[PDB]
Design a protein around this ligand. Sequence first.
Ligand SMILES: Cc1sc2c(c1C)C(c1ccc(Cl)cc1)=N[C@@H](CC(=O)OC(C)(C)C)c1[nH]nc(C)[n+]1-2
Ligand SMILES: [Cl-]
Length: 127
Amino acid sequence: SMNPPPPETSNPNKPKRQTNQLQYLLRVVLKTLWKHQFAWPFQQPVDAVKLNLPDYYKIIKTPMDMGTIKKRLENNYYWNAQECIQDFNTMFTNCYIYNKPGDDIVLMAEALEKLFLQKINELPTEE
Ligand SMILES: Cc1sc2c(c1C)C(c1ccc(Cl)cc1)=N[C@@H](CC(=O)OC(C)(C)C)c1[nH]nc(C)[n+]1-2
Ligand SMILES: [Cl-]
């Protein structure tokens, strides 16, 4: 069994900038979700080898996790907030696609997603 390489967190060919929205996504959104009691399965890529999920990366072809997002924010990898918001949504959607309603991991994603929604509702206007 073998895991794929993780998503990239650096790339000089990718355009990027800092924005107050992206600052908010790190200081408020990522920080809030990262400290949550249910964050830990989402803090790094799914290790399909150690978890014995050999079909994981047959079903999930756009991997994402908060470890990757955290690095992308810390590295100022993004051009805009939408790119980062999309990564969070991919992470949640992957969980729901792979798993089943009522599963513990789905309850965990739901709890993180609730907070994510609450925070992005007050994404500041671009300055
Ligand atoms: C490190 C990680 S990453 C992860 C899990 C764990 C443990 C857990 C999980 C985490 C916490 C609790 Cl309470 C229950 C399950 N679930 C798997 C899928 C699965 O069913 O795995 C087992 C067969 C359970 C190994 C899954 N899907 N998406 C993610 C992000 N995860
Ligand atoms: Cl980069």
